Ligand binder design. Structure first.
Ligand SMILES: Nc1ncnc2c1ncn2[C@@H]1O[C@H](COP(=O)(O)O)[C@@H](OP(=O)(O)O)[C@H]1O
Ligand SMILES: O=[N+]([O-])c1cc(N[C@@H]2CCN(Cc3c[nH]c4ccccc34)C2)ccc1CO
Length: 259
Protein backbone atom coordinates (compact mmCIF):
# COMPACT_ATOMS: atom_id res chain seq x y z
CA UNK A 1 0.00 0.00 0.00
CA UNK A 2 0.88 3.67 -0.09
CA UNK A 3 2.66 5.39 2.77
CA UNK A 4 0.53 8.03 4.49
CA UNK A 5 1.36 10.51 7.23
CA UNK A 6 -0.30 9.34 10.44
CA UNK A 7 -1.21 11.69 13.28
CA UNK A 8 0.68 11.25 16.58
CA UNK A 9 -2.38 10.90 18.81
CA UNK A 10 -4.13 7.95 20.42
CA UNK A 11 -5.50 5.86 17.55
CA UNK A 12 -6.06 2.56 19.40
CA UNK A 13 -7.37 2.00 22.94
CA UNK A 14 -6.82 -1.55 24.19
CA UNK A 15 -9.07 -2.48 27.11
CA UNK A 16 -7.50 -5.91 27.70
CA UNK A 17 -6.24 -6.81 31.16
CA UNK A 18 -2.62 -7.64 31.94
CA UNK A 19 -1.48 -11.11 30.88
CA UNK A 20 -3.75 -11.15 27.80
CA UNK A 21 -1.07 -10.37 25.20
CA UNK A 22 -0.75 -6.63 25.90
CA UNK A 23 3.02 -6.44 25.40
CA UNK A 24 2.90 -8.29 22.10
CA UNK A 25 0.09 -5.94 21.06
CA UNK A 26 2.16 -2.95 22.18
CA UNK A 27 5.05 -4.17 20.01
CA UNK A 28 2.65 -4.81 17.13
CA UNK A 29 1.16 -1.32 17.25
CA UNK A 30 4.63 0.22 17.32
CA UNK A 31 5.57 -1.82 14.25
CA UNK A 32 2.47 -0.51 12.47
CA UNK A 33 2.57 3.13 13.56
CA UNK A 34 6.30 3.76 14.22
CA UNK A 35 5.43 5.74 17.37
CA UNK A 36 5.24 4.59 20.98
CA UNK A 37 2.41 2.69 22.62
CA UNK A 38 1.67 3.02 26.35
CA UNK A 39 2.05 -0.07 28.56
CA UNK A 40 3.09 -0.76 32.13
CA UNK A 41 6.56 -1.44 30.74
CA UNK A 42 6.70 2.19 29.59
CA UNK A 43 6.32 3.19 33.25
CA UNK A 44 8.79 0.60 34.56
CA UNK A 45 11.55 1.16 32.03
CA UNK A 46 11.07 4.73 30.71
CA UNK A 47 8.75 6.84 32.88
CA UNK A 48 8.71 5.99 36.58
CA UNK A 49 8.00 9.69 37.12
CA UNK A 50 4.49 8.91 35.79
CA UNK A 51 3.65 6.65 38.76
CA UNK A 52 2.51 9.52 40.98
CA UNK A 53 0.56 11.07 38.11
CA UNK A 54 -1.41 7.88 37.50
CA UNK A 55 -1.99 7.53 41.24
CA UNK A 56 -3.36 11.08 41.39
CA UNK A 57 -5.65 10.39 38.44
CA UNK A 58 -7.05 7.21 39.95
CA UNK A 59 -7.46 9.07 43.25
CA UNK A 60 -9.61 11.71 41.53
CA UNK A 61 -11.37 9.36 39.09
CA UNK A 62 -14.49 8.99 41.27
CA UNK A 63 -15.40 12.56 40.23
CA UNK A 64 -15.85 11.58 36.57
CA UNK A 65 -19.40 11.80 35.29
CA UNK A 66 -19.85 9.65 32.19
CA UNK A 67 -20.51 11.91 29.19
CA UNK A 68 -22.28 13.28 27.40
CA UNK A 69 -22.58 15.97 28.49
CA UNK A 70 -19.16 16.99 29.85
CA UNK A 71 -18.97 18.37 33.39
CA UNK A 72 -16.27 20.75 34.63
CA UNK A 73 -14.65 18.23 37.00
CA UNK A 74 -14.53 15.59 34.24
CA UNK A 75 -12.74 17.96 31.88
CA UNK A 76 -10.04 18.57 34.49
CA UNK A 77 -9.44 14.84 34.90
CA UNK A 78 -9.57 14.17 31.17
CA UNK A 79 -6.96 16.92 30.65
CA UNK A 80 -4.50 15.13 32.93
CA UNK A 81 -5.08 11.83 31.18
CA UNK A 82 -4.53 13.44 27.78
CA UNK A 83 -1.29 14.96 29.12
CA UNK A 84 0.01 11.58 30.30
CA UNK A 85 -0.54 10.15 26.83
CA UNK A 86 0.96 12.98 24.78
CA UNK A 87 3.23 11.57 22.09
CA UNK A 88 1.75 8.07 22.17
CA UNK A 89 -0.33 6.45 19.44
CA UNK A 90 -2.06 3.79 21.53
CA UNK A 91 -2.71 2.49 25.04
CA UNK A 92 -2.48 -1.02 26.46
CA UNK A 93 -2.29 -2.64 29.88
CA UNK A 94 -2.63 -1.32 33.39
CA UNK A 95 -2.94 1.42 34.41
CA UNK A 96 -4.71 2.67 31.26
CA UNK A 97 -7.09 -0.17 30.50
CA UNK A 98 -9.60 0.69 33.25
CA UNK A 99 -9.89 4.14 31.69
CA UNK A 100 -11.07 2.75 28.32
CA UNK A 101 -14.49 4.49 28.51
CA UNK A 102 -12.95 7.85 29.32
CA UNK A 103 -10.32 7.40 26.61
CA UNK A 104 -13.12 6.74 24.13
CA UNK A 105 -14.51 10.19 24.95
CA UNK A 106 -11.15 11.96 24.83
CA UNK A 107 -10.20 10.32 21.52
CA UNK A 108 -13.48 9.86 19.63
CA UNK A 109 -11.64 8.76 16.48
CA UNK A 110 -9.68 6.01 18.22
CA UNK A 111 -10.61 2.37 17.75
CA UNK A 112 -11.00 -0.02 20.69
CA UNK A 113 -9.45 -3.47 21.19
CA UNK A 114 -10.16 -6.12 23.81
CA UNK A 115 -7.67 -8.92 24.26
CA UNK A 116 -9.08 -12.01 25.98
CA UNK A 117 -7.98 -15.53 26.83
CA UNK A 118 -8.92 -18.60 28.88
CA UNK A 119 -9.60 -17.35 32.41
CA UNK A 120 -7.59 -20.04 34.17
CA UNK A 121 -4.59 -19.51 31.90
CA UNK A 122 -4.96 -15.81 32.67
CA UNK A 123 -5.05 -16.34 36.43
CA UNK A 124 -2.06 -18.68 36.33
CA UNK A 125 -0.06 -16.11 34.36
CA UNK A 126 -1.17 -13.31 36.67
CA UNK A 127 -0.08 -15.23 39.76
CA UNK A 128 3.35 -15.93 38.27
CA UNK A 129 4.10 -12.34 37.27
CA UNK A 130 1.82 -9.59 38.52
CA UNK A 131 -0.14 -10.72 41.55
CA UNK A 132 1.44 -13.64 43.38
CA UNK A 133 -0.37 -14.89 46.46
CA UNK A 134 0.86 -13.43 49.76
CA UNK A 135 2.30 -16.73 50.95
CA UNK A 136 3.88 -17.78 47.64
CA UNK A 137 7.67 -17.96 48.18
CA UNK A 138 8.03 -16.72 44.60
CA UNK A 139 6.59 -13.38 45.70
CA UNK A 140 9.84 -12.66 47.58
CA UNK A 141 11.89 -13.30 44.45
CA UNK A 142 9.72 -10.97 42.39
CA UNK A 143 10.09 -8.29 45.07
CA UNK A 144 13.87 -8.69 45.02
CA UNK A 145 13.91 -8.21 41.24
CA UNK A 146 11.52 -5.28 41.55
CA UNK A 147 14.00 -3.51 43.82
CA UNK A 148 16.74 -3.90 41.22
CA UNK A 149 14.46 -2.03 38.80
CA UNK A 150 13.84 0.82 41.21
CA UNK A 151 10.25 -0.25 41.91
CA UNK A 152 9.10 0.37 45.47
CA UNK A 153 5.87 0.62 47.46
CA UNK A 154 4.40 3.38 45.26
CA UNK A 155 4.59 1.10 42.26
CA UNK A 156 2.88 -1.71 44.18
CA UNK A 157 0.15 0.71 45.20
CA UNK A 158 -0.37 1.74 41.58
CA UNK A 159 -0.65 -1.89 40.47
CA UNK A 160 -3.25 -2.65 43.13
CA UNK A 161 -5.20 0.57 42.75
CA UNK A 162 -5.32 0.42 38.97
CA UNK A 163 -6.58 -3.16 39.11
CA UNK A 164 -9.24 -2.12 41.62
CA UNK A 165 -10.19 0.78 39.37
CA UNK A 166 -10.52 -1.52 36.33
CA UNK A 167 -12.71 -3.91 38.34
CA UNK A 168 -14.70 -1.05 39.98
CA UNK A 169 -13.98 -2.42 43.47
CA UNK A 170 -13.45 -0.34 46.60
CA UNK A 171 -11.31 -3.17 47.92
CA UNK A 172 -10.31 -6.56 46.69
CA UNK A 173 -9.08 -9.77 48.31
CA UNK A 174 -6.04 -10.17 46.06
CA UNK A 175 -5.37 -13.64 47.47
CA UNK A 176 -8.82 -14.99 46.43
CA UNK A 177 -8.69 -16.75 43.05
CA UNK A 178 -12.48 -16.98 42.75
CA UNK A 179 -12.82 -13.21 43.22
CA UNK A 180 -10.22 -12.49 40.53
CA UNK A 181 -11.78 -14.94 38.07
CA UNK A 182 -15.20 -13.37 38.58
CA UNK A 183 -13.82 -9.84 38.14
CA UNK A 184 -12.06 -10.95 34.95
CA UNK A 185 -15.22 -12.38 33.40
CA UNK A 186 -17.30 -9.39 34.47
CA UNK A 187 -14.73 -6.90 33.16
CA UNK A 188 -14.56 -8.51 29.71
CA UNK A 189 -18.34 -8.79 29.56
CA UNK A 190 -18.77 -5.12 30.49
CA UNK A 191 -16.32 -3.96 27.79
CA UNK A 192 -18.35 -5.76 25.15
CA UNK A 193 -21.61 -4.31 26.47
CA UNK A 194 -20.22 -0.77 26.65
CA UNK A 195 -18.27 -0.30 23.41
CA UNK A 196 -20.36 -0.13 20.21
CA UNK A 197 -19.41 -3.24 18.27
CA UNK A 198 -18.49 -1.22 15.19
CA UNK A 199 -15.79 0.37 17.36
CA UNK A 200 -14.62 -2.86 19.07
CA UNK A 201 -12.36 -5.69 17.94
CA UNK A 202 -12.07 -8.69 20.27
CA UNK A 203 -8.70 -10.40 19.88
CA UNK A 204 -7.83 -13.80 21.26
CA UNK A 205 -4.23 -14.86 21.82
CA UNK A 206 -2.91 -16.30 18.58
CA UNK A 207 -5.10 -14.17 16.26
CA UNK A 208 -2.02 -12.50 14.76
CA UNK A 209 -1.83 -9.61 12.31
CA UNK A 210 -4.75 -10.12 9.98
CA UNK A 211 -7.86 -9.10 11.99
CA UNK A 212 -5.95 -6.26 13.66
CA UNK A 213 -4.62 -4.78 10.42
CA UNK A 214 -8.01 -5.06 8.70
CA UNK A 215 -9.66 -3.22 11.61
CA UNK A 216 -7.03 -0.45 11.41
CA UNK A 217 -6.98 -0.21 7.57
CA UNK A 218 -3.24 -0.92 7.41
CA UNK A 219 -1.17 -3.43 5.49
CA UNK A 220 0.22 -6.45 7.26
CA UNK A 221 3.89 -5.62 8.01
CA UNK A 222 6.00 -7.35 5.41
CA UNK A 223 8.11 -10.27 6.63
CA UNK A 224 7.56 -9.50 10.33
CA UNK A 225 5.87 -12.17 12.45
CA UNK A 226 3.25 -11.11 14.95
CA UNK A 227 4.99 -10.61 18.28
CA UNK A 228 5.12 -13.33 20.91
CA UNK A 229 6.74 -11.97 24.02
CA UNK A 230 6.31 -11.69 27.80
CA UNK A 231 5.51 -15.30 28.67
CA UNK A 232 5.59 -15.99 32.37
CA UNK A 233 8.53 -18.33 31.77
CA UNK A 234 10.45 -15.43 30.25
CA UNK A 235 9.49 -13.10 33.11
CA UNK A 236 10.66 -15.70 35.61
CA UNK A 237 14.04 -15.80 33.87
CA UNK A 238 14.20 -11.98 33.92
CA UNK A 239 13.49 -11.90 37.66
CA UNK A 240 16.17 -14.53 38.31
CA UNK A 241 18.75 -12.70 36.16
CA UNK A 242 17.97 -9.38 37.88
CA UNK A 243 18.61 -11.09 41.22
CA UNK A 244 21.82 -12.70 39.93
CA UNK A 245 23.44 -9.60 38.40
CA UNK A 246 21.71 -6.85 40.46
CA UNK A 247 21.27 -4.48 37.53
CA UNK A 248 19.15 -4.21 34.43
CA UNK A 249 21.97 -2.94 32.23
CA UNK A 250 24.07 -6.03 32.94
CA UNK A 251 21.42 -8.27 31.34
CA UNK A 252 19.26 -6.13 29.09
CA UNK A 253 20.96 -7.40 25.93
CA UNK A 254 19.71 -10.90 26.88
CA UNK A 255 16.06 -9.81 26.60
CA UNK A 256 15.46 -8.32 23.15
CA UNK A 257 11.92 -7.26 22.20
CA UNK A 258 10.75 -7.80 25.75
CA UNK A 259 12.69 -4.74 26.98
N1 LIG B 1 1.55 -14.08 19.90
C1 LIG B 1 1.16 -14.76 21.00
N2 LIG B 1 0.58 -16.01 20.93
C2 LIG B 1 0.21 -16.66 22.04
N3 LIG B 1 0.38 -16.19 23.29
C3 LIG B 1 0.92 -14.97 23.49
C4 LIG B 1 1.36 -14.18 22.34
N4 LIG B 1 1.85 -13.01 22.83
C5 LIG B 1 1.77 -13.09 24.18
N5 LIG B 1 1.22 -14.25 24.57
C6 LIG B 1 0.96 -14.59 25.99
O1 LIG B 1 0.37 -13.46 26.65
C7 LIG B 1 0.85 -13.39 28.01
C8 LIG B 1 1.54 -12.04 28.27
O2 LIG B 1 0.54 -11.03 28.27
P1 LIG B 1 0.91 -9.52 28.74
O3 LIG B 1 1.92 -9.05 27.76
O4 LIG B 1 -0.43 -8.86 28.66
O5 LIG B 1 1.44 -9.58 30.17
C9 LIG B 1 1.81 -14.55 28.16
O6 LIG B 1 1.06 -15.68 28.60
P2 LIG B 1 1.71 -16.77 29.59
O7 LIG B 1 2.24 -16.03 30.80
O8 LIG B 1 0.57 -17.73 29.89
O9 LIG B 1 2.84 -17.37 28.80
C10 LIG B 1 2.26 -14.77 26.72
O10 LIG B 1 2.88 -16.07 26.55
O1 LIG C 1 0.53 -4.18 37.30
N1 LIG C 1 0.67 -4.89 36.30
O2 LIG C 1 -0.35 -5.22 35.65
C1 LIG C 1 1.98 -5.28 35.95
C2 LIG C 1 2.92 -5.40 36.97
C3 LIG C 1 4.21 -5.80 36.64
N2 LIG C 1 5.23 -5.95 37.49
C4 LIG C 1 5.28 -6.02 38.92
C5 LIG C 1 6.21 -7.17 39.22
C6 LIG C 1 6.10 -7.10 40.72
N3 LIG C 1 4.74 -6.75 41.05
C7 LIG C 1 4.29 -8.02 41.60
C8 LIG C 1 4.31 -7.88 43.09
C9 LIG C 1 5.28 -8.34 43.99
N4 LIG C 1 4.89 -7.97 45.40
C10 LIG C 1 3.64 -7.27 45.25
C11 LIG C 1 2.86 -6.72 46.25
C12 LIG C 1 1.67 -6.09 45.86
C13 LIG C 1 1.28 -6.00 44.52
C14 LIG C 1 2.05 -6.55 43.49
C15 LIG C 1 3.23 -7.19 43.86
C16 LIG C 1 4.07 -6.35 39.79
C17 LIG C 1 4.57 -6.05 35.34
C18 LIG C 1 3.64 -5.91 34.33
C19 LIG C 1 2.35 -5.54 34.64
C20 LIG C 1 1.41 -5.43 33.47
O3 LIG C 1 2.20 -5.39 32.30
Amino acid sequence: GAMIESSTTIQVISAGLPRTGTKSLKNALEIIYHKPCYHMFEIIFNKQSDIIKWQNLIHDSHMITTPPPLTTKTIAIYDKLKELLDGYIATTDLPTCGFYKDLMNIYPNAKVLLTIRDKYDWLHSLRKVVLPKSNDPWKLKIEEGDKVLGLNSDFYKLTEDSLKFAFQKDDLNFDDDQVLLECYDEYNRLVQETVPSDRLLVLRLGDGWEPLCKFLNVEIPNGIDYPCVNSHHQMTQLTEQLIKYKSLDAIIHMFPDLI
